[PDB]
């Protein structure tokens, strides 16, 4: 007897009359995926025996015996089902009623009822793998995942990624971190951090605070990683609990690529960058004059104005002027030499 | 936007970005019969207004407004949904998101989730009509009724009838009742009680104890009733709280028909019957003899033996004998006259 549906009733042969001897009936119950089987009895009147060897109602799956019943509900300290519900672990349940050759006493058999019960994948998933990254939503026959505001559900319909490439660092100094640092970084993400400075600046990179990127003890960064592209060269990949040593580039532009796979709760990383340059030589103020601003050292694009004392003016070639402006160039040289001061005579 | 299924997600236009102005979207959610709609929100960010007149999320049925939401979940003492679930009374739910012409502030809208929820017809049915007579069984998408052991589920798939015609009363006296008397009699049943005595007996009927058959104040027995067929004549129908007066039939056979409809909890009835007959005249013992058994009155089929004293014998015609047997016939006459006793001389 084969049966696939959502509910049903099962009775012993002859019910409500006494069952015949030498009878064996099997009922196979299959429900769709995402459902389990719930079974209970309204009447149970069978012959009692050791391990229910003679007459019995056997409830099982394809590889597991769930329960075996016999005896009469009237007499107690018995192997009867009573008010107990039999729940299948999966979407299949097999029931066998067996009656041997000896039916001296007239037992009336049983009356059973079953139905499909929705599996709540959300309250079992935490004991599994392979569960919703953020939110889990249960429904009749299945489930689905959703994400926190500002996150995007990935192609796996499970993990929550972010858009982390809409950036451009143009300032002389700055801070760059993994998304939500130092909280666990978003899974299944591909972050592109771009540092773009003017021609002549050189970017220095320095990691700080927590550094936590998922790694492997034998294989170099097979899960998550940082790659740093400077010129036609890629540095890394970088991962683990130890940040790479400070990086001094000879470039005004740097690309930081941060890749995260579909697994882990690692805290991420943080770095600070600084745009340096070539150091210009010490400047000596002209006789009867001055140079502003007075700095210990001068770097690329630094501007200085040369001035003279009252009663004197700056002399360029054989031409007089109030101030002259010089700048520290990319190659580490000044735009011009320091001119002299000429009296008003 | 039309949507018929078991689950789903709904977002405001532009989500997760700010919604556009002058927009109006309606989502119609229909589920199969035996299901309701469950609705909740994960994000809600709207403009706040008196009775949500400007921007709003309106949740309604075909004839009833369930809820109206507006405002931002951040600010409290608001008209936001929060963690509250909106449950539809039936299998239909309509949702309208409206945005007016004024979207100065940039509200991010909403994120909603819905699913079909099984109706448990068993826990609401008692507040209805038209419910399971005995047992109610709930399942996903519907329900069904079943009956107590010894009862049969009627063609209405709701009421529980019995087989109450497998009887035959042949004894001189007896008791007949409605099934399970004095407990409520089974609905949708047709009971045939047959009294069959030998030719010459006359059945007398007498109701006793509780008499409770569903009746109507204006119409004679339109629901449940007793009909009594004696010969080619039917007595009744009988119903109500008052039993009919004792019935003296002139018949050895009586049929009692008891009809019960699909409604009520009336206790029923009980009667006792007695098979009478014609009374035979007083018998006088013969001179020098006796008659056994000595009774006050004699009725149909009563047997008596005529005997004589020691030294005498019964005389029939001119023939001597030890005992003579006479019987009380159907017509109220004796089979023979009392013979005399003759000495042994
Ligand atoms: C309704 O559900 C019922 C319950 O699941 C199912 O009934 C059967 O369930 C048992 C498990 O499937 C089954 O027992 C099996 O019998 C196998 C013997 O037959 C196979 O091998 C021979 C050759 O030797 C072939 O000629 C046959 O065609 C057949 O392929 C036996 O090999 C098997 O044992 C192995 O597998 C189990 C898996 O759990 C291992 O634990 C075990 O160690 C072995 O490796 C197993 O015993 C049994 O016959 C039957 N149950 C009863 C009570 O009779 C119904 O078939 C299913 N209905 C439908 C329509 O599919
Ligand atoms: C998706 O579900 C939506 C919500 O139920 C539904 O949208 C509509 O829902 C309202 C109720 O059905 C509807 O309002 C009705 O409008 C009727 C006016 O149009 C009718 O009459 C004119 C002639 O006057 C005809 O030309 C039209 O073709 C049409 O037949 C109006 O008569 C009606 O009011 C009566 O009925 C209600 C019943 O509850 C009584 O309370 C009331 O007293 C009146 O007797 C009612 O107001 C509305 O237009 C619309 N909602 C919105 C927000 O626009 C969708 O139609 C449904 N989708 C599908 C595919 O069916
Ligand atoms: C999260 O993960 C899965 C996988 O990303 C998502 O489900 C997907 O499932 C399949 C692809 O594996 C898609 O189904 C197909 O859609 C086609 C377009 O609608 C349709 O034509 C296909 O039907 C036929 O397919 C073959 C022929 O190609 C044939 O043998 C069949 O008999 C059909 O006639 C088929 O349905 C899904 O579209 C796809 N996406 C979605 C949105 O479901 C899910 O999002 C999700 N899964 C779970 C379980 O959560
Ligand atoms: C308790 O009450 C009802 C009523 O007694 C029970 O359900 C019954 O419902 C209908 C009769 O109203 C039956 O359904 C039909 O069964 C036919 C044989 O299987 C089948 O051919 C029919 O299909 C077609 O019907 C018409 C053509 O005649 C056509 O328009 C349709 O499109 C179909 O193609 C139809 O399904 C049921 O068989 C009947 N009995 C049962 C057991 O369901 C129920 O027992 C119960 N109802 C509830 C809700 O509890
Ligand atoms: Ca057990
Ligand atoms: Ca047995
Ligand atoms: Ca589920
Ligand atoms: Ca963010
Ligand atoms: Ca670790
Ligand atoms: Ca990882
Ligand atoms: Ca409310
Ligand atoms: Ca507005
Ligand atoms: Ca139900
Ligand atoms: Ca009974
Ligand atoms: Ca009453
Ligand atoms: Ca009635």
Tokens 């700095």 belong to residue: A295
Answer yes or no: is A19 a known binding residue: no
Indicate if B101 and B31 belong to the same structural domain.
yes
- Quote the minimal CA–CA distance from B13 to chain A in Å: 15
Cβ atoms within 10 A of the Cβ of A316, count?
Answer: 14
Determine whether the interchain pair B139/A116 forms a contact, defined as Cβ–Cβ distance below 8 Å: yes
Identify the CATH number of the domain in which residue A318 sits: 2.10.70.10
Tokens 């882990």 belong to residue: A264
For the record, the structure tokens of A29 come out as 């119950």
CA dist A174 and A221 (Å) reads 26
Which among B5, B10, B67, B11 has a CA at the least distance from the CA of B35?
B5
Indicate if A131 and A77 belong to the same structural domain.
no
Q: What is the dihedral of CA A204, A208, A214, A217, to 10 degrees?
A: 80
Which among A218, A258, A268 has a CA at the least distance from the CA of A237?
A258
Cα–Cα distances (Å) from B209 to B84, B204, B267, B268, in that order, read 58, 17, 11, 10
Cβ atoms within 10 A of the Cβ of B336, count?
Answer: 12
CA dist B124 and B117 (Å) reads 15
CA dist B106 and B99 (Å) reads 12
Determine whether the interchain pair B149/A108 forms a contact, defined as Cβ–Cβ distance below 8 Å: yes
For the record, the structure tokens of A129 come out as 């793998």
- A28 CB less than 6 Å from ligand 1? yes
Answer yes or no: is A91 a known binding residue: no
Domain end position, chosen among A160, A186, A218:
A160
CA dist B293 and B304 (Å) reads 6
Indicate if A253 and A305 belong to the same structural domain.
no
Residue B341 backbone phi and psi in degrees, to 5: -100, 135
Print the SS3 string covering chain A.
CEEECCEEEEECCCCCCCCCCCEEEEEEEECCCCEEEEEEEEEEECCCCHHHCCCEEEEECCCCEEEEECCECCCCCCCCCCCCCEECCCCEEEEEEEECCCCCCCCCEEEEEEEEEECCHHHCHHHCCCCCCCEEEEECCEEEEECCCCCEECCCCCCEECCCCCCCECCCEEEEECCCCCCCCCCCCEEEEEEECCCCCEEEEEECCCCEECCCCCCCCCCCEEEEEECCEEEEEECECCCCCCEECCCCEEEEEEECCCCCCCCECEEEEEEECCEECCCCCCCCEEEECCCCCEECCCEEEEEECCCEEEEECCEEECCEEEEECCCCCECCCCCEEEECC
Indicate if B104 and B172 belong to the same structural domain.
no
Closest ligand 4 atom to residue B158 Cα is 1
Cα–Cα distances (Å) from B208 to A314, B171, B182, B211, in that order, read 140, 19, 11, 8
Residues with Cβ < 8 Å from B271, sequence gap 6 or more?
B175, B176, B177, B205, B206, B207, B208, B256
Three-state SS for B98?
A: strand
Answer yes or no: is A345 a known binding residue: no
Identify the CATH number of the domain in which residue A127 sits: 2.10.25.10
CA closest to A110 among chain B residues = B149
Three-state SS for B69?
A: strand
Declared resolution, Å:
4.2
Give the total number of structural domains in chain B.
Answer: 4
Indicate if A55 and A128 belong to the same structural domain.
no
Tokens 């000595």 belong to residue: B294
Ligand closest to B151 (CA) is 14
Indicate if B211 and B168 belong to the same structural domain.
yes
Which experiment gave this structure? X-ray
Sign of the Cα pseudo-torsion (A17, A19, A25, A27, in order): positive
Indicate if B197 and B255 belong to the same structural domain.
yes
Residue B259 backbone phi and psi in degrees, to 5: -110, 135
Indicate if A245 and A226 belong to the same structural domain.
yes
Indicate if A156 and A185 belong to the same structural domain.
no
Determine whether the interchain pair A42/B108 forms a contact, defined as Cβ–Cβ distance below 8 Å: no
Domain end position, chosen among A276, A301, A333:
A276
Tokens 């004024």 belong to residue: B102
Residues with Cβ < 8 Å from B312, sequence gap 6 or more?
B288, B289, B341, B342, B343, B344
Give first-to-last CA distance, chain A, whole Å.
Answer: 125
- Would you say B341 and B289 are in contact if contact means Cβ atoms under 8 Å apart? yes
- Quote the minimal CA–CA distance from A85 to chain B in Å: 14
Indicate if B51 and B76 belong to the same structural domain.
yes
Burial category of B227 from C-beta neighbours within 10 Å (exposed 0-12, middle 13-18, buried 19 and up): middle
Burial category of B187 from C-beta neighbours within 10 Å (exposed 0-12, middle 13-18, buried 19 and up): buried
Indicate if B110 and B138 belong to the same structural domain.
no
| A42 vs B135, B138, B144: nearest CB | B135
CA dist B46 and B106 (Å) reads 9
Domain carrying residue B48 = 2-117
Tokens 């249960």 belong to residue: A138
Cα–Cα distances (Å) from A15 to A20, A108, B136, in that order, read 10, 6, 20
Task: Suggest the residue from A6, A137, A147 to mutate for an interface test with chain B (most B CBs closer than 10 A).
Answer: A137
∠ CA A79-A48-A45, nearest 5°, is 80
Rg of the Cα atoms in chain A: 41
Which among A30, A140, A132, A41 has a CA at the least distance from the CA of A88?
A30
CA dist A177 and A162 (Å) reads 14
CA dist B1 and A45 (Å) reads 56
For the record, the structure tokens of B224 come out as 């449940």
Indicate if A114 and A170 belong to the same structural domain.
no
| Residues flanking ion ligand 6, Cβ below 5 Å | A 47, 54-55, 100, 102
From chain A, pick out residues whose CB is under 8 angstroms from the CB of B115: 137-140
Determine whether the interchain pair A113/B149 forms a contact, defined as Cβ–Cβ distance below 8 Å: no
Identify the CATH number of the domain in which residue A189 sits: 2.60.120.290
From chain A, pick out residues whose CB is under 8 angstroms from the CB of B114: none
- A137 CB less than 6 Å from ligand 3? no
Element (H, E) at B330: none
Cα A199 to ligand 12 centroid, rounded to whole Å: 48
Domain end position, chosen among A118, A147, A173:
A118
């Amino acid at each position: 007897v084969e049966l696939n549906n959502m509910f049903g009733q099962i009775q012993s042969p002859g019910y409500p009359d006494s069952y015949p001897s030498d009878s064996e009936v099997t009922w196979n119950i299959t429900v769709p995926d995402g459902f389990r089987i719930k079974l209970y009895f309204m009447h149970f009147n069978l012959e009692s025996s050791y391990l229910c060897e003679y007459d019995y109602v056997k409830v099982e799956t394809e590889d597991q015996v769930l329960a075996t019943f016999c005896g009469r509900e009237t007499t107690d300290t018995e192997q009867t089902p009573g008010q107990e519900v039999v729940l299948s672990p999966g979407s299949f349940m097999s029931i066998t009623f067996r009656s041997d050759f000896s039916n001296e006493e007239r037992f009336t058999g049983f009356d059973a009822h079953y139905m499909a019960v929705d599996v709540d994948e959300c309250k079992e998933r935490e004991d599994e793998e392979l569960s919703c990254d953020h939110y889990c939503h249960n429904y009749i026959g299945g489930y689905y995942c959703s994400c926190r505001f500002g996150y995007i559900l990935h192609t796996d319909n499970r993990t929550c990624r972010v858009e982390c490439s809409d950036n451009l660092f143009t300032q002389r100094t700055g801070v760059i971190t993994s998304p939500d640092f130092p909280n666990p970084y978003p899974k299944s993400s591909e972050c592109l951090y771009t540092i773009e400075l003017e021609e002549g600046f050189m970017v220095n990179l320095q990691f700080e605070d927590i550094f936590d990127i998922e790694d492997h003890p034998e294989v170099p960064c097979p899960y998550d990683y940082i790659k740093i592209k400077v010129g036609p060269k890629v540095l890394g990949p970088f991962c683990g609990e130890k940040a790479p040593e400070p990086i001094s580039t000879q470039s005004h532009s740097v690309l930081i690529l941060f890749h995260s796979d579909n697994s882990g709760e690692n805290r991420g990383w943080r770095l600070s960058y600084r745009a340096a340059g070539n150091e210009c030589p010490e400047l000596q103020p002209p006789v009867h004059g001055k140079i502003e601003p007075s700095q210990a050292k001068y770097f690329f694009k630094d501007q200085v104005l040369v001035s003279c004392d009252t009663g004197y003016k700056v002399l360029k070639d054989n031409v007089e002027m109030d101030t002259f402006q010089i700048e520290c160039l990319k190659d580490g040289t000044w735009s011009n030499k320091i001119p002299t001061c000429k009296k008003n005579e």
